[PDB]
Design a protein around this ligand. Structure first.
Ligand SMILES: *[C@@H]1O[C@H](CO)[C@@H](O[C@@H]2O[C@H](CO)[C@@H](O)[C@H](O)[C@H]2NC(C)=O)[C@H](O)[C@H]1NC(C)=O
Ligand SMILES: *[C@@H]1O[C@H](CO)[C@@H](O[C@@H]2O[C@H](CO)[C@@H](O)[C@H](O)[C@H]2NC(C)=O)[C@H](O)[C@H]1NC(C)=O
Ligand SMILES: *[C@@H]1O[C@H](CO)[C@@H](O[C@@H]2O[C@H](CO)[C@@H](O)[C@H](O)[C@H]2NC(C)=O)[C@H](O)[C@H]1NC(C)=O
Ligand SMILES: *[C@@H]1O[C@H](CO)[C@@H](O[C@@H]2O[C@H](CO)[C@@H](O)[C@H](O)[C@H]2NC(C)=O)[C@H](O)[C@H]1NC(C)=O
Ligand SMILES: *[C@@H]1O[C@H](CO)[C@@H](O[C@@H]2O[C@H](CO)[C@@H](O)[C@H](O)[C@H]2NC(C)=O)[C@H](O)[C@H]1NC(C)=O
Ligand SMILES: *[C@@H]1O[C@H](CO)[C@@H](O[C@@H]2O[C@H](CO)[C@@H](O)[C@H](O)[C@H]2NC(C)=O)[C@H](O)[C@H]1NC(C)=O
Ligand SMILES: *[C@@H]1O[C@H](CO)[C@@H](O[C@H]2O[C@H](CO)[C@@H](O)[C@H](O)[C@H]2NC(C)=O)[C@H](O)[C@H]1NC(C)=O
Ligand SMILES: *[C@@H]1O[C@H](CO)[C@@H](O[C@H]2O[C@H](CO)[C@@H](O)[C@H](O)[C@H]2NC(C)=O)[C@H](O)[C@H]1NC(C)=O
Ligand SMILES: *[C@H]1O[C@H](CO)[C@@H](O[C@@H]2O[C@H](CO)[C@@H](O)[C@H](O)[C@H]2NC(C)=O)[C@H](O)[C@H]1NC(C)=O
Ligand SMILES: CC(=O)N(C)[C@H]1CC[C@H]([C@H](C)[C@H](N)C(=O)N2CC[C@H](F)C2)CC1
Ligand SMILES: CC(=O)N(C)[C@H]1CC[C@H]([C@H](C)[C@H](N)C(=O)N2CC[C@H](F)C2)CC1
Ligand SMILES: *[C@@H]1O[C@H](CO)[C@@H](O)[C@H](O)[C@H]1NC(C)=O
Ligand SMILES: *[C@@H]1O[C@H](CO)[C@@H](O)[C@H](O)[C@H]1NC(C)=O
Ligand SMILES: *[C@@H]1O[C@H](CO)[C@@H](O)[C@H](O)[C@H]1NC(C)=O
Ligand SMILES: *[C@@H]1O[C@H](CO)[C@@H](O)[C@H](O)[C@H]1NC(C)=O
Ligand SMILES: *[C@@H]1O[C@H](CO)[C@@H](O)[C@H](O)[C@H]1NC(C)=O
Ligand SMILES: *[C@@H]1O[C@H](CO)[C@@H](O)[C@H](O)[C@H]1NC(C)=O
Ligand code: NA
Lengths: 728, 728
């Protein structure tokens, strides 16, 4: 009897998934790490060479966290002393190694505790942020030019984002942008002077006598937001003037009337930058296209080049206005926007004409634009077979839009339905990444003829190991509700038998534009629960989910905590009605938004669920950040949406929790969804006499991803689920 | 057939113990609040009159928290707007009602947010502290005089104690001491300038968007302590034109040489005051006796009247040097101190004589001196029947120490073996409060011939109700360990059958000088556990416990977390060998110091315990305050006792928790044993892969006593214990 996929297998990673991570360094060569060695590969033939011997930095005296080769291949940036901050931010030390001289640079070194560093897009210029100020080095071993002097910890951020901009807007810590050839350096300046601070204790090692109080500028819903400013400095003039002038580009009058955000920066050409701004009421955004004026040394944005983007049904963009992709001459660009029918498609824009032309359409959506050449635009969409949970690479001819070729659909339709791509520098080659439903498969392709060059990694090793294991299966399908299709997936136990009644665990997330029903292959907790515990783990994408049009996505506009919560309940009913579900053993669990929804469901009084687990849940929207929360809920004021803000809290449902078994979990150092959110849930439950299970994780954040905590929480949750299901 | 004492009975207080709290106002009368009325009783005959009508303040407009009649009966202080702070501290608003003119005073009223107020011991003067400064009012309706001007929140405390002095030294918020007739007002001043602050979050009601951060000057082991100064002011010579003059009384040189504490202030006569100082290394204290000089107007403390008290085996006193009891003329005094055999007895001191004479002796201890006349000294001791857990009132003839008379021993030996007492002004009368082993019995007596005048409260109502309930019994006995006997108590289930096997819960505290095996009658969680769940709840007093001499109490000196932990395991080990104990079902639980011992036991590797519960435990001594920790552990430096500080932690024992079920509980707003302590325990368990149960209580402090949390914690713990024991 073959063994099953156990909890230990998941926690110890016995069945390891292989991947192929490469870095394009040109139009036909890429870097690949193999046995601490860094090899360079010729895309066209697959032949390689040792680029950087693994013994090159033995006597460095430091463990190297990561490396970065300058665009011209002349130097290598070595990162060490890595110290994580939020989701993207961290501090580190850096050394620069001269590849030619093969010596390590020891003069004018990058400062320790550098917040961010980046090579210019061409050559080997460096820009970095230290103590909240920007600096630039024209040559690795020469003195830096200070760009800003206003830098101030927790107050003024130059070239780097504050907490909310890092997390909700740019998904990056950096806030600087080199022009295409590196002449200009643009950046944003965030001012958090009046932004309230979230404060929580950090206990650290046992040896710390007094706990530390972490303090971070974090704007909760309706609170004072940070303000922002944008600038551009000409780095080519740095060695000619004592203090180079950072030219400011002010936001349009339509944004200056109130609170607003800088939400996108994209260079069009060497002398043209585009910026998108968004009103604090995220249903109106403006894109400025600015040109350098060589005579005044200033930047001007012609109103005839200004593009407006608004929404009547919801907010703008999936999570923010989409980025523009400019054609080489910078006179036109492509951008994904939802059409008249509410589906996101590629629109072609002339920079000085307000009406764009859609080049794609249909009841499906474009996920992202991946590359653009003078002849073709390549993109990923979920058009194939009408599966919103699938993803494929497409190629559309710019001189004839009726010519669209799917480059990935038919490569291996049974094993691969969820693709990702990585083009080389001039899109001459591309690596395809298949992530499901079968084992991931990585392949390399030639753009000139779209022919497959070779397989890079097929995961045969794992395929062999999984042969002796009773792996569960996955079912992706849909049910119809109100004449609308809604997708779901089920991780079914091995030897599944429709004639039996299985206990069911509803795995939920359900935030706006989410998708929990896809064709991706995963080895996770649900795998163990299905394979070893014979539990059916299901997920449903109802109202509010994404990639299926604005009619479904904007259904929860200004109404979080309603429809996406109800559809999840309805989904469980529908499932039990399928006849292979033990109606007496139905659980639900989720993390983050998933924990909120799980909590809301357990407190609805539906009677459908027996027990549930909420990890790091949101409990009341006024505790979450302004940018994310307000986008879907507007402002928490009586003149706007306060009533629904006060009506969608978990706490007000405390009483119904007497009907279920609940396990509440939260990391104490969660900087994202503050431990405060669970502290208020527990207090509310204690106040109405409700018993439940709880667990805090000392010094863990929203991810509770430290090696030990990760194993501990899933172990703890397994016991709770087995117990609720009366399983040995 | 009849009911049992259930968990709801404990939580809802179905069975209430009646009390009789009176207040002596003279040597002949006392106040007793009845029907919300204040009656004055004549001790000799028992007749009374109404002193103040419950309806008198019907239209007050504020909920009166408490009252306080001036010594001369002319005024009454009304307390309202009560807001709790720490264990004894709080702020409130006050109003004074003139009992003569039946009118509420409206001129020059005490400020709101007053920190402490107190009448002069005689007459009707007032002294209060507001905004950390001292004020005095000679008359209720007259403008107060400002005594101090250095008051500064969290920095300078005048007339009130800081966090550590409140909790660990004075067991009071007040730091004011009126001379016997009210002429002088002595006060202490605390400076916490360099005392680090403990910081933690307070979430408050759901409506508070941002968690609040509480900051409290709290010196942990080895940290910078607050400094103290002592002053005395003449309240008979205050001027409304000039600022009151305070005379300082510096501490002795043997104290000034290093860190020290003021630990006792006791007026001897109208013009003599005594003070005891303790060195930071708590085994050396000095009592100064100071006399007022009418010529200079200073206070002189003659070196010839200096008294030293030191210890070679541990610290001084039970929790600090004992208080002196001066004779009328103030030329001699009585003080409890451990004799050469290590037992605490009453010693007689001449103020200018170095040697004191013991007036009691034997293998038992005096608990406290209760009253003194020229002919007798009245005290409480555990001498009767050699039971260290019993308490009785005795009087000893000051002219012949061989004549000791027990006054409570024989009153009712079956029902009463534990007494406390309350004497009237000149000890003409005394109230006896019996609290075990039977129901509490309150009686009144006359001193002249020790007549038993009358029964004030015998709890016959409760006795009648308890008859319809299957109440558990209590066994008090001792086991031997190395020729030394150690006492324990067992709360046994109804109809105890020695031929059956009962699960056993070890209820432990075990801090230094503690006692958990006594004759006191109690209705608590254990009552329910034994009466309804048939669980034997036992407690044991081992090395480190009090009232049995220094040989036992000082056994854990400089070694907390060793013998007191081992002895609990030995006791349980011995209980398991008894025929009525199911050695497969033995648990342990404790709170505070008991949470620490319980945790140290569960992590001992003994194998004796199946499960255990720790509520707000200490996890490592460096996290607890200086005054209490150093008393028993010395300083946490390598030159002193750091090595033992480091291996007496719970954390270092994480690994051993694999074979037990552990439930860890703690309130997040605990200002005493910081949540930090449990946060480090959970992190250490997570780090070694040990699963356990946990529960935090939002905004609850060390007592977790708010009505809802109290019910919730005991409910939750009950489920845990019943599950550990396989109980329906
Ligand atoms: C991959 O192989 C190619 C061709 O085999 C290498 O190209 C070299 O091109 C130069 C041109 O000046 C010739 O002199 C060399 O003899 C060629 N090498 C070989 C093996 O033919 C290319 O350098 C190789 N790239 C890597 C990364 O190994
Ligand atoms: C960041 O924004 C704050 C406003 O919140 C600016 O501070 C003000 O600066 C002006 C001009 O010096 C002063 O008159 C005000 O008193 C300041 N207000 C506050 C609340 O401090 C600050 O100058 C901005 N910093 C930068 C670099 O732009
Ligand atoms: C470089 O130029 C900038 C901009 O002129 C200088 O920044 C100003 O510094 C002065 C005095 O230090 C302040 O009063 C202004 O508020 C600053 N303006 C800005 C935009 O920061 C900077 O100090 C100059 N550095 C040097 C070395 O001259
Ligand atoms: C990068 O682009 C910039 C901007 O076009 C170039 O700088 C200009 O160069 C022209 C000469 O071709 C001069 O007439 C302008 O005065 C320059 N403008 C500025 C703002 O510097 C730069 O030469 C380009 N770099 C490279 C390597 O081609
Ligand atoms: C409280 O005791 C003080 C001190 O013994 C009394 O004050 C003294 O009284 C005598 C007689 O009137 C004066 O000659 C002294 O000069 C006073 N000394 C001081 C320091 O004031 C006071 O009278 C007593 N108060 C009461 C109410 O008995
Ligand atoms: C009071 O207790 C302290 C602490 O034990 C004693 O001081 C010294 O402590 C160190 C540390 O163990 C020993 O090495 C010394 O032998 C102790 N004695 C001295 C004089 O330093 C101190 O002796 C105790 N005082 C009394 C009166 O017993
Ligand atoms: C208790 O009873 C006595 C009488 O036995 C009361 O009487 C004494 O005090 C009264 C006023 O306080 C006077 O009217 C009596 O003359 C006086 N008698 C004696 C013998 O002292 C006494 O007041 C009563 N006490 C209370 C508190 O009611
Ligand atoms: C309270 O204690 C502080 C700390 O010792 C006293 O001030 C002292 O410490 C300051 C900062 O540590 C120093 O800057 C001062 O020089 C030092 N002495 C003085 C007189 O400030 C402070 O005075 C004390 N306050 C009172 C009212 O006693
Ligand atoms: C302490 O606060 C109370 C309440 O504010 C003061 O009492 C009065 O309260 C009323 C409203 O309830 C106000 O209109 C008055 O201004 C307050 N003062 C008076 C004299 O009525 C109280 O006076 C305050 N105590 C002190 C010493 O100022
Ligand atoms: C895809 C994209 O471009 N962006 C910018 C995303 C915007 C939402 C981010 C989180 C999901 C969210 N910030 C969070 O942590 N929540 C926790 C509470 C609530 F569920 C949201 C992740 C990046
Ligand atoms: C009897 C007496 O005179 N005094 C001054 C006592 C000294 C200890 C005090 C607490 C018991 C202690 N402070 C505490 O809360 N701990 C928690 C950790 C440790 F168990 C002690 C109570 C008053
Ligand atoms: C590169 O270094 C790794 C780790 O030190 C080692 O396993 C490997 O043998 C080295 N490369 C080669 C080709 O041996
Ligand atoms: C970084 O820190 C190390 C360690 O203290 C120090 O030796 C080195 O000189 C520092 N480098 C820079 C650029 O400051
Ligand atoms: C933007 O959203 C606000 C809030 O609902 C609304 O009042 C306004 O009309 C919206 N503007 C557009 C163009 O939909
Ligand atoms: C005073 O009020 C209480 C209720 O607060 C009431 O029970 C009692 O009867 C009243 N006292 C008198 C003498 O009526
Ligand atoms: C009393 O002393 C304080 C403290 O400096 C001073 O501010 C106040 O003015 C003084 N008042 C008189 C009358 O001297
Ligand atoms: C006596 O018993 C104690 C515990 O009560 C034990 O620790 C000690 O080693 C034994 N022997 C002596 C000589 O004290
Ligand atoms: Na009697």
């Amino acid at each position: 009897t073959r063994k099953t996929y156990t909890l230990t297998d998941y926690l110890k990673n016995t069945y390891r998934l292989k991947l192929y991570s490469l870095r394009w360094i040109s139009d036909h060569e890429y870097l690949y790490k193999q046995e601490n060695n860094i090899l360079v590969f010729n895309a066209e033939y697959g032949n390689s060479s040792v680029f950087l011997e693994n013994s090159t930095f033995d006597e460095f005296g430091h463990s190297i966290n990561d490396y970065s080769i300058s665009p011209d291949g002349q130097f290598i940036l070595l990162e060490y002393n890595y110290v994580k901050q939020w989701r993207h931010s961290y501090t580190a030390s850096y050394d620069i190694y001269d590849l030619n001289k093969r010596q390590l640079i020891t003069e004018e070194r990058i400062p320790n505790n550098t917040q961010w560093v980046t090579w210019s897009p061409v050559g080997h210029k460096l820009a970095y942020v230290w103590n909240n100020d920007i600096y630039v080095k024209i040559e690795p071993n020469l003195p830096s030019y200070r760009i800003t002097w206003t830098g101030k910890e927790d107050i003024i951020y130059n070239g780097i984002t504050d907490w909310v901009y890092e997390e909700e807007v740019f998904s990056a810590y950096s806030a600087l942008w080199w022009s295409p050839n590196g002449t200009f350096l643009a950046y944003a300046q965030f001012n958090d002077t009046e932004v309230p601070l979230i404060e929580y204790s950090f206990y650290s090692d046992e040896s710390l006598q007094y706990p530390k109080t972490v303090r971070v500028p974090y704007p909760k819903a309706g609170a004072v937001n940070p303000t922002v400013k944008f600038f551009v400095v000409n780095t080519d003039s740095l060695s000619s003037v004592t203090n180079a002038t950072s030219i400011q580009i002010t936001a349009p009058a339509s944004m200056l009337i109130g609170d607003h955000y800088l939400c996108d920066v994209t260079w069009a050409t060497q002398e043209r930058i585009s910026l998108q701004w968004l009103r604090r009421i995220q249903n109106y955004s403006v894109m400025d296209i600015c040109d350098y004026d060589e005579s005044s040394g200033r930047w001007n944005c012609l109103v005839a080049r200004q593009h407006i983007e608004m929404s009547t049904t919801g907010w703008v963009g999936r999570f923010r206005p989409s980025e523009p992709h400019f054609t080489l001459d910078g006179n036109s660009f492509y951008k994904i926007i939802s059409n008249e029918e509410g589906y996101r498609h590629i629109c072609y824009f002339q920079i000085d004409k307000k009406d764009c032309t859609f080049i794609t359409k249909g009841t499906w959506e474009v996920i992202g634009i991946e590359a653009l050449t003078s002849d073709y635009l390549y993109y990923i969409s979920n058009e194939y077979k009408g599966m919103p949970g699938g993803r494929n690479l497409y190629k559309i001819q710019l001189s004839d839009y009726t010519k669209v070729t799917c480059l990935s659909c038919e490569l291996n339709p049974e094993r691969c339905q969820y693709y990702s791509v990585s083009f080389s520098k001039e899109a001459k080659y591309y690596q395809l990444r298949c992530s499901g439903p079968g084992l991931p498969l990585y392949t390399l392709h030639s753009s000139v003829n779209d022919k497959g060059l070779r397989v890079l990694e097929d995961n045969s090793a794992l395929d062999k190991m999984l042969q002796n294991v009773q792996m569960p299966s996955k079912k992706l399908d849909f049910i119809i509700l109100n004449e609308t299709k809604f997708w779901y997936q089920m991780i079914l136990p091995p030897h599944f038998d429709k004639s039996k009644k299985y206990p069911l665990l509803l795995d939920v997330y359900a935030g706006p534009c989410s998708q929990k029903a896809d064709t991706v292959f995963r080895l996770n907790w649900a795998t163990y629960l299905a394979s070893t515990e014979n539990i059916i783990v299901a997920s449903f994408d109802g109202r509010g989910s994404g990639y299926q049009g604005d009619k479904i996505m904007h259904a929860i506009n200004r109404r979080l905590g309603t429809f996406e919560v109800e559809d999840q309940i309805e989904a469980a009913r529908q499932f039990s009605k399928m006849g292979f579900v033990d109606n007496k053993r139905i659980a639900i669990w989720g993390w983050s938004y998933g924990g909120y929804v799980t909590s809301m469901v357990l407190g609805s009084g539906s009677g459908v669920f027996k027990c549930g687990i909420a990890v790091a849940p949101v409990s009341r929207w006024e505790y979450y950040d302004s940018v994310y929360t307000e986008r879907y809920m507007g402002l928490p004021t009586p003149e706007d949406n306060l009533d629904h803000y006060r009506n969608s809290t978990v706490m007000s449902r405390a009483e119904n929790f007497k009907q279920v078994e609940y396990l509440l979990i939260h990391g104490t150092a969660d900087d994202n969804v503050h431990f405060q959110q669970s502290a208020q849930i527990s207090k509310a439950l204690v106040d109405v006499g409700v018993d439940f299970q709880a667990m805090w994780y000392t010094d863990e954040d929203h991810g509770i991803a430290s090696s030990t905590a990760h194993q501990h929480i899933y172990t703890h949750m397994s016991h709770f689920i087995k117990q609720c299901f009366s399983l040995p």
